[PDB]
Amino acid sequence: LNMKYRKRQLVTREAQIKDWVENELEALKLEAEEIPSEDQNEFLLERTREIHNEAESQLRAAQQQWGNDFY
Amino acid sequence: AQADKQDISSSTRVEFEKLYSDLMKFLESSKEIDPSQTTQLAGMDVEDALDKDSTKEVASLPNKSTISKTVSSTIPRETIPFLHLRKKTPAGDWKYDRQLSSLFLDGLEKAAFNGVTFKDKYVLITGAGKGSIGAEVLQGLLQGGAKVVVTTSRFSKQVTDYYQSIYAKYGAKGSTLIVVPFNQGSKQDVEALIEFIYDTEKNGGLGWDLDAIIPFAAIPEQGIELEHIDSKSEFAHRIMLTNILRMMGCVKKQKSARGIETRPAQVILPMSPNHGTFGGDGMYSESKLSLETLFNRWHSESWANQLTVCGAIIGWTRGTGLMSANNIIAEGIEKMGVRTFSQKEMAFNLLGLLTPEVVELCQKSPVMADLNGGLQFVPELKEFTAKLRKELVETSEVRKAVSIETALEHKVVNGLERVIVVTGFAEVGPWGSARTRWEMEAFGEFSLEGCVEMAWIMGFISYHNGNLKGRPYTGWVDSKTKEPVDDKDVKAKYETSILEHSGIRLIEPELFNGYNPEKKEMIQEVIVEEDLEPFEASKETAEQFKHQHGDKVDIFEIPETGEYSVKLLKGATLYIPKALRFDRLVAGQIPTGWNAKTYGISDDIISQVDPITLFVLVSVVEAFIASGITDPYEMYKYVHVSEVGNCSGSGMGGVSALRGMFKDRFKDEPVQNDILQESFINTMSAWVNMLLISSSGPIKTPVGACATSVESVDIGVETILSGKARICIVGGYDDFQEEGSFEFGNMKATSNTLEEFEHGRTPAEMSRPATTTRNGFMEAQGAGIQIIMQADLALKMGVPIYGIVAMAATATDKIGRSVPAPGKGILTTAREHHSSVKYASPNKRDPRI
């Protein structure tokens, strides 16, 4: 596998973690307001800026392997 | 791959060469083919402001040496050949018997085109190297494939590298190259010389048979007429004939001891046709005539099947370094009586006088040969030789006389995020900064902007001489040698030869006189006791007497009370002093150094921390300017919790005052009590912590000794592979102490002189890997540091960066009964582990790689 591959880096992760960015946007989009419209941005800036961390956690975790820990 | 234009052409010649390699692969032992466009003579009397030129033309009708046979073939006027092979004329002298001479012509004609190998000839050389003929006779015999061994009158470093180039430049597939110094005179030695070259390998070595011999002489002996049979020229008259006569007999006496007497040995003899002929020669002429007794002696004296005499008349060759009078004319000689051969490659013909179809004919008979290019056809050589120069020296001079008076006439009238990189590196080794030695690994020269760095260290320059107030008026240059020689000492043209070798030949051996602190090494203070019975009653100062009383009890040395004084002294049979003894130590003098260590560094820390700790302290600043980042406080503007930091400094020694604690304490030398903090191996990093950049984060400090300082990289890179720490800094230094040596070499590892002296004196060498003369490696004091960064803060406000981290050590997984045992599979075989379960196809754990 030792060639600088990037394909399975792009195929399984970098698509599935890119699957639920919009589906993780959808994971908020069941609670669209539901009594926000007074607490909307607190519902925005808490969940959205913490699900970005999970994607960012999953970003380096996918890039743990595929080169940084390819072996 | 074709991106470079040259590379295609490189590839073009490559396969061209590769085929030429492949065709000649496993063939004979190559050639003798000196395919260089041979010149002749180029004398040029310059008209105006210059005199005689020099030489080296291009020679008309030549180019290829194939022509150079043919040109040398059909000589001029009433001639057979320019170089001929005569015969002992059955009644008379050396008449050009063209019959046998044809073959030598043919053998020379056999040359050039066909390669001329000489494999397994067993040859030996008296004459010099770089100066004259024998080096050419050496070189073709290397590419002839011959097993060759050589002497030298001198012996030096300057000659040792000289041949060492040539075996790396001309030694063919099967040639063998070994040198040895040898005085030709003082004839006792040649018995040991003839021993060693026929000795078995259970003796000194070189189990050879020695089937060719060239004894080329020395000692110019100029300007002496008949009535002076004076000193060492007389001794020179021995060494042209006597010892070489005494040489060849014991060859046979060695050979016929074994009795391999149907395999003879060649001797080629430098003859001279010009005896009673030149001027202030002295003994040189009739000494050369002495060689000709062998022709009668080869018949009728029972050694003929062993020694193969084939002399060489050769002379009047340019390429003057020595023995060659008249590096001048060469041309009127080839004009008045046009006869040839003022060249340099006569020895090419002499190589042809060591080939088969010739030496077999020399097995039949000795061969007198007039190789000299018709020079004997000149009536009155010598005065006409003078006559050419005396016309030429005036016409050069009188034209040089013309212009100066013209000038006399003329002058009067007129007026990521875990892969980690190294960012600043700096070592203080034996030499200067790491930037200095990077040239010293590259060249021998010190690159004057870099050479003054060697002078900025060692206190040699005196930079910051005052911008104002130089030598009496204003003006300033970075001075040198505090106040004798402050005259302007420039980083341009100066500093060569006024800061050189005296400034350079202090960093390699004799290890010092008076540095560590003294450590003479010619005498080592080794101490023995005694218990005789004299009794002394010396004088003391009080309170020493009680530890006198406590040490040796009251049945000895009742002190006394020394009234109106302190106390009194020795009593009984004393059982002490451990006085001293003059003892000789062999092993020593590998490193040296720097002769000065105070940069701009704060004093009075150098009262306390001292011995090795300066070197790491300068090093980390040296790495920080290598990082280009001074002010280490200004890292925390990348604001952290500051929990990251410190190095992992390492080293077995550092003893350096523990000998003060052990030898000098209990012998009472005044050393500070606070040395116990300075005893340990981590306290170096503590002043890298405290009186330097001062975060109290992670510190590891392994040992790794006898192969150290690589290990702290790995534990350091683990700390940044961990999230426990960002930016870190490495281990480093070895160090050298007097208790280190002798307790070095008692474990028989490092090196040992005298057998480093006695083999080849060469004290700057001291390191012979893999050309089979190893003695261990070396030891140096040394100090070295590299720093490393998070690759992101290394990017963000770029430090800058060097390279790429590589490896990971420490899985020993081994036991035996030895220390030290070298690196076998005990290390670096878990490195490139690669267990190989059945794959047959490619593409943390990874059982593949």
PDB file of C-alpha atoms in Angstrom, chain B residues 224-457:
ATOM      1  CA  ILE B 224      82.524  18.459  -9.842  1.00  0.00           C
ATOM      2  CA  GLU B 225      85.522  17.623 -12.076  1.00  0.00           C
ATOM      3  CA  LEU B 226      87.996  14.757 -11.669  1.00  0.00           C
ATOM      4  CA  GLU B 227      90.220  15.759  -8.728  1.00  0.00           C
ATOM      5  CA  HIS B 228      87.287  15.731  -6.260  1.00  0.00           C
ATOM      6  CA  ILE B 229      86.329  12.268  -4.998  1.00  0.00           C
ATOM      7  CA  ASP B 230      84.762  14.058  -2.044  1.00  0.00           C
ATOM      8  CA  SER B 231      82.074  13.169   0.510  1.00  0.00           C
ATOM      9  CA  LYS B 232      78.609  11.763   0.159  1.00  0.00           C
ATOM     10  CA  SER B 233      78.859  11.838  -3.642  1.00  0.00           C
ATOM     11  CA  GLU B 234      81.345   9.050  -2.896  1.00  0.00           C
ATOM     12  CA  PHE B 235      78.633   7.418  -0.819  1.00  0.00           C
ATOM     13  CA  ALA B 236      76.371   8.140  -3.758  1.00  0.00           C
ATOM     14  CA  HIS B 237      78.825   6.275  -5.957  1.00  0.00           C
ATOM     15  CA  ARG B 238      78.170   3.288  -3.728  1.00  0.00           C
ATOM     16  CA  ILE B 239      74.425   3.503  -4.024  1.00  0.00           C
ATOM     17  CA  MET B 240      74.371   3.696  -7.790  1.00  0.00           C
ATOM     18  CA  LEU B 241      76.099   0.377  -8.092  1.00  0.00           C
ATOM     19  CA  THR B 242      77.151  -1.427  -4.933  1.00  0.00           C
ATOM     20  CA  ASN B 243      73.937  -2.092  -3.059  1.00  0.00           C
ATOM     21  CA  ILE B 244      71.994  -2.820  -6.224  1.00  0.00           C
ATOM     22  CA  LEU B 245      74.687  -5.284  -7.111  1.00  0.00           C
ATOM     23  CA  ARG B 246      74.323  -6.589  -3.586  1.00  0.00           C
ATOM     24  CA  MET B 247      70.574  -6.486  -4.170  1.00  0.00           C
ATOM     25  CA  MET B 248      70.139  -8.934  -6.988  1.00  0.00           C
ATOM     26  CA  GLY B 249      72.327 -11.721  -5.651  1.00  0.00           C
ATOM     27  CA  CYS B 250      70.358 -12.312  -2.479  1.00  0.00           C
ATOM     28  CA  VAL B 251      67.186 -12.323  -4.558  1.00  0.00           C
ATOM     29  CA  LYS B 252      68.509 -15.479  -6.153  1.00  0.00           C
ATOM     30  CA  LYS B 253      69.836 -16.616  -2.786  1.00  0.00           C
ATOM     31  CA  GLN B 254      66.324 -16.192  -1.500  1.00  0.00           C
ATOM     32  CA  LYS B 255      64.881 -17.758  -4.639  1.00  0.00           C
ATOM     33  CA  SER B 256      67.262 -20.679  -4.877  1.00  0.00           C
ATOM     34  CA  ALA B 257      66.689 -21.318  -1.202  1.00  0.00           C
ATOM     35  CA  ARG B 258      63.230 -22.412  -2.283  1.00  0.00           C
ATOM     36  CA  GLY B 259      64.397 -23.700  -5.632  1.00  0.00           C
ATOM     37  CA  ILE B 260      61.763 -22.350  -7.994  1.00  0.00           C
ATOM     38  CA  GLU B 261      64.674 -21.609 -10.302  1.00  0.00           C
ATOM     39  CA  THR B 262      62.867 -22.276 -13.605  1.00  0.00           C
ATOM     40  CA  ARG B 263      60.910 -19.059 -13.135  1.00  0.00           C
ATOM     41  CA  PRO B 264      63.395 -16.231 -13.581  1.00  0.00           C
ATOM     42  CA  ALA B 265      63.254 -12.577 -12.610  1.00  0.00           C
ATOM     43  CA  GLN B 266      63.684  -9.466 -14.721  1.00  0.00           C
ATOM     44  CA  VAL B 267      66.179  -6.704 -14.027  1.00  0.00           C
ATOM     45  CA  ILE B 268      66.078  -3.596 -16.195  1.00  0.00           C
ATOM     46  CA  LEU B 269      69.102  -1.376 -15.846  1.00  0.00           C
ATOM     47  CA  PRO B 270      69.337   2.368 -16.416  1.00  0.00           C
ATOM     48  CA  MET B 271      72.340   2.750 -18.696  1.00  0.00           C
ATOM     49  CA  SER B 272      73.888   5.979 -19.913  1.00  0.00           C
ATOM     50  CA  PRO B 273      75.545   6.425 -23.311  1.00  0.00           C
ATOM     51  CA  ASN B 274      77.313   9.600 -22.242  1.00  0.00           C
ATOM     52  CA  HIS B 275      80.297   8.822 -20.048  1.00  0.00           C
ATOM     53  CA  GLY B 276      83.383  10.957 -20.121  1.00  0.00           C
ATOM     54  CA  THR B 277      80.945  13.167 -22.014  1.00  0.00           C
ATOM     55  CA  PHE B 278      79.173  15.738 -19.851  1.00  0.00           C
ATOM     56  CA  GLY B 279      80.607  18.362 -17.529  1.00  0.00           C
ATOM     57  CA  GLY B 280      80.604  18.656 -13.754  1.00  0.00           C
ATOM     58  CA  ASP B 281      79.353  15.140 -13.255  1.00  0.00           C
ATOM     59  CA  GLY B 282      81.815  13.505 -10.889  1.00  0.00           C
ATOM     60  CA  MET B 283      81.156   9.880 -10.058  1.00  0.00           C
ATOM     61  CA  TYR B 284      77.925   9.554 -12.025  1.00  0.00           C
ATOM     62  CA  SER B 285      79.425   8.614 -15.386  1.00  0.00           C
ATOM     63  CA  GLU B 286      81.772   5.680 -14.761  1.00  0.00           C
ATOM     64  CA  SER B 287      79.316   4.395 -12.163  1.00  0.00           C
ATOM     65  CA  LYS B 288      76.836   3.970 -14.990  1.00  0.00           C
ATOM     66  CA  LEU B 289      79.454   2.123 -17.017  1.00  0.00           C
ATOM     67  CA  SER B 290      79.734  -0.367 -14.152  1.00  0.00           C
ATOM     68  CA  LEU B 291      76.438  -2.005 -15.037  1.00  0.00           C
ATOM     69  CA  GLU B 292      77.767  -3.562 -18.230  1.00  0.00           C
ATOM     70  CA  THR B 293      79.779  -6.262 -16.495  1.00  0.00           C
ATOM     71  CA  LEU B 294      76.572  -8.301 -16.245  1.00  0.00           C
ATOM     72  CA  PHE B 295      76.589  -9.152 -19.948  1.00  0.00           C
ATOM     73  CA  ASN B 296      79.730 -11.195 -19.572  1.00  0.00           C
ATOM     74  CA  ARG B 297      78.590 -12.126 -16.087  1.00  0.00           C
ATOM     75  CA  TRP B 298      75.236 -13.483 -17.236  1.00  0.00           C
ATOM     76  CA  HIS B 299      77.045 -16.106 -19.181  1.00  0.00           C
ATOM     77  CA  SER B 300      79.357 -18.419 -17.223  1.00  0.00           C
ATOM     78  CA  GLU B 301      78.199 -17.433 -13.721  1.00  0.00           C
ATOM     79  CA  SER B 302      75.490 -19.660 -12.350  1.00  0.00           C
ATOM     80  CA  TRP B 303      72.554 -17.378 -11.916  1.00  0.00           C
ATOM     81  CA  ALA B 304      71.426 -16.963 -15.523  1.00  0.00           C
ATOM     82  CA  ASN B 305      68.176 -18.888 -15.125  1.00  0.00           C
ATOM     83  CA  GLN B 306      67.122 -16.540 -12.356  1.00  0.00           C
ATOM     84  CA  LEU B 307      68.003 -12.990 -13.353  1.00  0.00           C
ATOM     85  CA  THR B 308      66.907 -11.463 -16.636  1.00  0.00           C
ATOM     86  CA  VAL B 309      69.094  -8.516 -17.560  1.00  0.00           C
ATOM     87  CA  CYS B 310      67.739  -5.968 -20.037  1.00  0.00           C
ATOM     88  CA  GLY B 311      69.316  -2.558 -19.648  1.00  0.00           C
ATOM     89  CA  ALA B 312      68.025   0.851 -20.668  1.00  0.00           C
ATOM     90  CA  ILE B 313      70.252   3.510 -22.241  1.00  0.00           C
ATOM     91  CA  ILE B 314      67.524   6.181 -22.000  1.00  0.00           C
ATOM     92  CA  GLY B 315      68.226   9.856 -21.467  1.00  0.00           C
ATOM     93  CA  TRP B 316      67.747  13.477 -22.497  1.00  0.00           C
ATOM     94  CA  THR B 317      64.098  13.613 -21.576  1.00  0.00           C
ATOM     95  CA  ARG B 318      62.184  16.707 -20.603  1.00  0.00           C
ATOM     96  CA  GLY B 319      59.607  16.790 -17.849  1.00  0.00           C
ATOM     97  CA  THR B 320      62.208  18.374 -15.630  1.00  0.00           C
ATOM     98  CA  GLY B 321      61.588  18.205 -11.941  1.00  0.00           C
ATOM     99  CA  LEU B 322      64.975  16.682 -11.157  1.00  0.00           C
ATOM    100  CA  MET B 323      67.981  14.923 -12.785  1.00  0.00           C
ATOM    101  CA  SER B 324      67.175  16.753 -16.054  1.00  0.00           C
ATOM    102  CA  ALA B 325      69.714  19.369 -16.994  1.00  0.00           C
ATOM    103  CA  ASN B 326      68.595  21.713 -19.782  1.00  0.00           C
ATOM    104  CA  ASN B 327      64.943  22.298 -19.361  1.00  0.00           C
ATOM    105  CA  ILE B 328      65.620  24.846 -22.114  1.00  0.00           C
ATOM    106  CA  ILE B 329      66.584  24.071 -25.617  1.00  0.00           C
ATOM    107  CA  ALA B 330      65.236  20.732 -26.900  1.00  0.00           C
ATOM    108  CA  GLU B 331      64.704  22.149 -30.362  1.00  0.00           C
ATOM    109  CA  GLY B 332      67.967  23.052 -32.026  1.00  0.00           C
ATOM    110  CA  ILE B 333      68.988  19.566 -31.007  1.00  0.00           C
ATOM    111  CA  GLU B 334      66.052  18.417 -33.108  1.00  0.00           C
ATOM    112  CA  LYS B 335      67.175  20.904 -35.749  1.00  0.00           C
ATOM    113  CA  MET B 336      70.956  20.642 -36.056  1.00  0.00           C
ATOM    114  CA  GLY B 337      71.134  16.921 -36.524  1.00  0.00           C
ATOM    115  CA  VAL B 338      67.359  16.589 -36.167  1.00  0.00           C
ATOM    116  CA  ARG B 339      67.504  13.442 -33.962  1.00  0.00           C
ATOM    117  CA  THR B 340      64.562  12.822 -31.760  1.00  0.00           C
ATOM    118  CA  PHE B 341      63.307  12.184 -28.239  1.00  0.00           C
ATOM    119  CA  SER B 342      63.277  15.213 -25.964  1.00  0.00           C
ATOM    120  CA  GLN B 343      59.916  14.028 -24.643  1.00  0.00           C
ATOM    121  CA  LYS B 344      58.650  12.623 -21.339  1.00  0.00           C
ATOM    122  CA  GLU B 345      57.097   9.268 -22.228  1.00  0.00           C
ATOM    123  CA  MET B 346      60.154   7.147 -22.955  1.00  0.00           C
ATOM    124  CA  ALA B 347      58.952   4.886 -20.150  1.00  0.00           C
ATOM    125  CA  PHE B 348      56.118   3.849 -22.436  1.00  0.00           C
ATOM    126  CA  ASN B 349      58.839   2.071 -24.380  1.00  0.00           C
ATOM    127  CA  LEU B 350      60.163   0.699 -21.111  1.00  0.00           C
ATOM    128  CA  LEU B 351      56.761  -0.807 -20.361  1.00  0.00           C
ATOM    129  CA  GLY B 352      57.141  -2.545 -23.696  1.00  0.00           C
ATOM    130  CA  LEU B 353      60.376  -3.921 -22.337  1.00  0.00           C
ATOM    131  CA  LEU B 354      58.449  -5.912 -19.750  1.00  0.00           C
ATOM    132  CA  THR B 355      56.111  -7.807 -22.012  1.00  0.00           C
ATOM    133  CA  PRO B 356      56.077 -11.358 -23.331  1.00  0.00           C
ATOM    134  CA  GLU B 357      57.532 -11.958 -26.799  1.00  0.00           C
ATOM    135  CA  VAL B 358      60.351  -9.831 -25.342  1.00  0.00           C
ATOM    136  CA  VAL B 359      61.180 -11.216 -21.917  1.00  0.00           C
ATOM    137  CA  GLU B 360      61.133 -14.692 -23.419  1.00  0.00           C
ATOM    138  CA  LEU B 361      63.713 -13.322 -25.803  1.00  0.00           C
ATOM    139  CA  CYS B 362      65.331 -11.904 -22.698  1.00  0.00           C
ATOM    140  CA  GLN B 363      65.202 -15.417 -21.255  1.00  0.00           C
ATOM    141  CA  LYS B 364      67.432 -16.246 -24.206  1.00  0.00           C
ATOM    142  CA  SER B 365      69.837 -13.320 -23.971  1.00  0.00           C
ATOM    143  CA  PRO B 366      70.443  -9.893 -22.450  1.00  0.00           C
ATOM    144  CA  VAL B 367      69.377  -7.055 -24.717  1.00  0.00           C
ATOM    145  CA  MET B 368      71.574  -4.033 -25.164  1.00  0.00           C
ATOM    146  CA  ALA B 369      69.297  -1.472 -26.767  1.00  0.00           C
ATOM    147  CA  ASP B 370      70.014   2.030 -28.031  1.00  0.00           C
ATOM    148  CA  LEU B 371      66.665   3.504 -27.063  1.00  0.00           C
ATOM    149  CA  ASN B 372      68.306   6.916 -27.199  1.00  0.00           C
ATOM    150  CA  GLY B 373      66.925   8.764 -30.194  1.00  0.00           C
ATOM    151  CA  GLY B 374      69.974   9.022 -32.411  1.00  0.00           C
ATOM    152  CA  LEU B 375      71.699  11.386 -29.985  1.00  0.00           C
ATOM    153  CA  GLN B 376      75.021   9.585 -30.452  1.00  0.00           C
ATOM    154  CA  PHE B 377      74.993  10.671 -34.093  1.00  0.00           C
ATOM    155  CA  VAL B 378      75.933  14.171 -32.943  1.00  0.00           C
ATOM    156  CA  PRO B 379      79.670  14.776 -33.040  1.00  0.00           C
ATOM    157  CA  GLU B 380      80.445  17.113 -30.107  1.00  0.00           C
ATOM    158  CA  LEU B 381      77.273  17.022 -28.096  1.00  0.00           C
ATOM    159  CA  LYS B 382      78.448  18.951 -25.092  1.00  0.00           C
ATOM    160  CA  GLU B 383      80.025  22.121 -26.412  1.00  0.00           C
ATOM    161  CA  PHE B 384      77.306  22.373 -29.026  1.00  0.00           C
ATOM    162  CA  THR B 385      74.885  21.860 -26.156  1.00  0.00           C
ATOM    163  CA  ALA B 386      76.569  24.848 -24.578  1.00  0.00           C
ATOM    164  CA  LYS B 387      76.640  26.589 -27.951  1.00  0.00           C
ATOM    165  CA  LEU B 388      72.864  26.452 -28.288  1.00  0.00           C
ATOM    166  CA  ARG B 389      72.261  27.987 -24.911  1.00  0.00           C
ATOM    167  CA  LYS B 390      74.951  30.661 -25.095  1.00  0.00           C
ATOM    168  CA  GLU B 391      73.420  31.992 -28.270  1.00  0.00           C
ATOM    169  CA  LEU B 392      69.974  31.660 -26.776  1.00  0.00           C
ATOM    170  CA  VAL B 393      70.663  33.184 -23.383  1.00  0.00           C
ATOM    171  CA  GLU B 394      72.060  36.398 -24.838  1.00  0.00           C
ATOM    172  CA  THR B 395      69.374  36.933 -27.472  1.00  0.00           C
ATOM    173  CA  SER B 396      66.741  36.566 -24.801  1.00  0.00           C
ATOM    174  CA  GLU B 397      68.769  38.874 -22.567  1.00  0.00           C
ATOM    175  CA  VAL B 398      69.686  41.429 -25.201  1.00  0.00           C
ATOM    176  CA  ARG B 399      66.036  41.772 -26.158  1.00  0.00           C
ATOM    177  CA  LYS B 400      65.264  42.024 -22.452  1.00  0.00           C
ATOM    178  CA  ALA B 401      68.107  44.518 -22.463  1.00  0.00           C
ATOM    179  CA  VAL B 402      66.470  46.403 -25.345  1.00  0.00           C
ATOM    180  CA  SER B 403      63.168  47.199 -23.677  1.00  0.00           C
ATOM    181  CA  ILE B 404      64.516  48.339 -20.305  1.00  0.00           C
ATOM    182  CA  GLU B 405      66.738  50.936 -21.920  1.00  0.00           C
ATOM    183  CA  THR B 406      63.768  51.740 -24.122  1.00  0.00           C
ATOM    184  CA  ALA B 407      61.785  52.149 -20.906  1.00  0.00           C
ATOM    185  CA  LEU B 408      64.679  54.119 -19.445  1.00  0.00           C
ATOM    186  CA  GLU B 409      64.518  56.236 -22.585  1.00  0.00           C
ATOM    187  CA  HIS B 410      60.735  56.429 -22.507  1.00  0.00           C
ATOM    188  CA  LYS B 411      60.169  57.281 -18.851  1.00  0.00           C
ATOM    189  CA  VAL B 412      62.511  60.267 -18.883  1.00  0.00           C
ATOM    190  CA  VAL B 413      60.942  62.296 -21.692  1.00  0.00           C
ATOM    191  CA  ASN B 414      57.375  61.959 -20.472  1.00  0.00           C
ATOM    192  CA  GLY B 415      55.856  63.556 -17.398  1.00  0.00           C
ATOM    193  CA  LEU B 416       1.295  17.210  10.002  1.00  0.00           C
ATOM    194  CA  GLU B 417       1.280  18.381  13.643  1.00  0.00           C
ATOM    195  CA  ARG B 418       3.122  15.249  14.766  1.00  0.00           C
ATOM    196  CA  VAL B 419       5.808  14.795  12.116  1.00  0.00           C
ATOM    197  CA  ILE B 420       8.573  16.943  13.477  1.00  0.00           C
ATOM    198  CA  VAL B 421      11.476  18.781  11.921  1.00  0.00           C
ATOM    199  CA  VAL B 422      14.806  20.128  13.109  1.00  0.00           C
ATOM    200  CA  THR B 423      15.059  23.904  13.123  1.00  0.00           C
ATOM    201  CA  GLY B 424      18.367  24.991  14.642  1.00  0.00           C
ATOM    202  CA  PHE B 425      21.473  22.867  14.930  1.00  0.00           C
ATOM    203  CA  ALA B 426      24.892  23.609  16.283  1.00  0.00           C
ATOM    204  CA  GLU B 427      27.787  21.544  17.447  1.00  0.00           C
ATOM    205  CA  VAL B 428      31.092  22.551  18.964  1.00  0.00           C
ATOM    206  CA  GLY B 429      33.323  19.676  17.970  1.00  0.00           C
ATOM    207  CA  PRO B 430      37.122  19.672  17.831  1.00  0.00           C
ATOM    208  CA  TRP B 431      37.022  22.401  15.233  1.00  0.00           C
ATOM    209  CA  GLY B 432      34.971  25.599  15.345  1.00  0.00           C
ATOM    210  CA  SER B 433      31.279  26.040  14.638  1.00  0.00           C
ATOM    211  CA  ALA B 434      29.379  23.420  12.686  1.00  0.00           C
ATOM    212  CA  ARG B 435      29.489  25.874   9.798  1.00  0.00           C
ATOM    213  CA  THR B 436      33.269  25.710   9.911  1.00  0.00           C
ATOM    214  CA  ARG B 437      33.572  21.948   9.746  1.00  0.00           C
ATOM    215  CA  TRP B 438      30.948  21.712   7.000  1.00  0.00           C
ATOM    216  CA  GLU B 439      33.622  23.275   4.870  1.00  0.00           C
ATOM    217  CA  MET B 440      36.206  21.061   6.485  1.00  0.00           C
ATOM    218  CA  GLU B 441      34.294  18.000   5.491  1.00  0.00           C
ATOM    219  CA  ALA B 442      34.031  19.613   2.075  1.00  0.00           C
ATOM    220  CA  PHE B 443      37.525  20.982   1.584  1.00  0.00           C
ATOM    221  CA  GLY B 444      40.774  21.499   3.405  1.00  0.00           C
ATOM    222  CA  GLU B 445      40.608  25.246   2.873  1.00  0.00           C
ATOM    223  CA  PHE B 446      38.658  27.460   5.251  1.00  0.00           C
ATOM    224  CA  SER B 447      36.929  29.939   2.903  1.00  0.00           C
ATOM    225  CA  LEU B 448      38.246  33.254   4.195  1.00  0.00           C
ATOM    226  CA  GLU B 449      34.904  34.582   5.463  1.00  0.00           C
ATOM    227  CA  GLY B 450      34.723  31.220   7.216  1.00  0.00           C
ATOM    228  CA  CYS B 451      38.418  31.154   8.018  1.00  0.00           C
ATOM    229  CA  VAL B 452      38.213  34.223  10.193  1.00  0.00           C
ATOM    230  CA  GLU B 453      35.462  32.467  12.119  1.00  0.00           C
ATOM    231  CA  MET B 454      38.232  30.091  13.133  1.00  0.00           C
ATOM    232  CA  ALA B 455      40.085  33.209  14.170  1.00  0.00           C
ATOM    233  CA  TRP B 456      37.094  34.701  15.957  1.00  0.00           C
ATOM    234  CA  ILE B 457      37.153  31.588  18.054  1.00  0.00           C
TER     235      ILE B 457
END
